[PDB]
Enzyme design. Structure first.
Site, PDB file in Angstrom:
ATOM      1  CB  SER A 189     -11.699   9.250  -1.399  1.00 37.54           C
ATOM      2  OG  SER A 189     -11.454   8.090  -2.162  1.00 37.54           O
ATOM      3  CG  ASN A 220      -8.696   6.448  -3.728  1.00 43.29           C
ATOM      4  OD1 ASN A 220      -7.716   5.780  -3.991  1.00 43.29           O
ATOM      5  ND2 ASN A 220      -9.121   6.622  -2.520  1.00 43.29           N
ATOM      6  CG  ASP A 235      -6.310   5.606  -1.088  1.00 42.60           C
ATOM      7  OD1 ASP A 235      -7.438   5.328  -0.709  1.00 42.60           O
ATOM      8  OD2 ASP A 235      -5.959   5.665  -2.296  1.00 42.60           O
ATOM      9  CG  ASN A 271     -11.195   4.809   1.610  1.00 42.01           C
ATOM     10  OD1 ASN A 271     -12.134   5.512   1.930  1.00 42.01           O
ATOM     11  ND2 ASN A 271     -11.276   3.492   1.563  1.00 42.01           N
ATOM     12  CD  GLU A 320      -3.013  -0.685   0.101  1.00 43.61           C
ATOM     13  OE1 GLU A 320      -2.828   0.243  -0.696  1.00 43.61           O
ATOM     14  OE2 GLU A 320      -3.979  -1.441  -0.002  1.00 43.61           O
ATOM     15  CG  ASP A 334     -13.772   8.104  -4.545  1.00 46.03           C
ATOM     16  OD1 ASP A 334     -12.584   8.407  -4.381  1.00 46.03           O
ATOM     17  OD2 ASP A 334     -14.461   7.606  -3.660  1.00 46.03           O
TER      18      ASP A 334
END
Ligand SMILES: CC(=O)N[C@@H]1[C@@H](O)[C@H](O[C@@H]2O[C@H](CO)[C@@H](O)[C@H](O)[C@H]2NC(C)=O)[C@@H](CO)O[C@@H]1O
Ligand SMILES: [Cl-]
Ligand SMILES: [Cl-]
Ligand SMILES: [Cl-]
Ligand SMILES: [Cl-]
Ligand SMILES: [Cl-]
Ligand code: NA
Ligand code: NA
Length: 129
Positions: free
Chosen positions: A50, A46, A52, A59, A35, A48
């Site tokens: 958002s 991301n 992380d 997120n 990650e 959308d």
């Protein structure tokens, strides 16, 4: 902070992640590796909108508040910036909530794609724990 593998393993173990919800420590180390490359300051946006955050790339759509993910939740009840701390407590405590939510570690895309079904114990091999 960029953790070493075993350092992170030990930190995660101290914070109760070893076998947390049945996920051996190597799962968590593997997830963190893929990650965030063990970097607590990792952020990624991301599709959308958002973001992380942190070593486990938690997120802001669901788990933390970053003030710029409208309509999102903050289920860990933390500013997302808390997940960037060199102190992994906030990330761990949030991860415990996430992994407890019914989907296990599948919440971590990198874990699903790169750790799940692999010999995750390799990630803690050689570590003093
Ligand atoms: C526990 C956690 O926060 N995991 C992150 C995933 O949530 C990220 O996946 C992305 O999550 C956003 C917000 O829910 C989704 O809109 C987006 O589709 C999803 N991306 C993918 C490819 O599934 C993931 C992004 O790399 O990072 C962590 O695993
Ligand atoms: Cl490494
Ligand atoms: Cl393991
Ligand atoms: Cl927000
Ligand atoms: Cl810590
Ligand atoms: Cl599970
Ligand atoms: Na990610
Ligand atoms: Na949020």
């Amino acid at each position: 902070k960029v953790f070493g593998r075993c350092e992170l393993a030990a930190a995660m173990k101290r914070h109760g992640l070893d076998n947390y919800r049945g996920y051996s420590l190597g799962n968590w180390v593997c997830a963190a590796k893929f990650e965030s490359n063990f970097n607590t300051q990792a952020t990624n946006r991301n599709t959308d909108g958002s973001t992380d955050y942190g070593i486990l790339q938690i997120n802001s759509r669901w788990w933390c508040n970053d003030g710029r993910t409208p309509g999102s939740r903050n289920l860990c009840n933390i500013p997302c910036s808390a997940l960037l701390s060199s102190d992994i407590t906030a990330s761990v405590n949030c991860a415990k909530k996430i992994v407890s939510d019914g989907n296990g570690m599948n919440a971590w895309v990198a874990w699903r794609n790169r750790c799940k079904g692999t010999d995750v114990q390799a990630w803690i091999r050689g570590c003093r724990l």
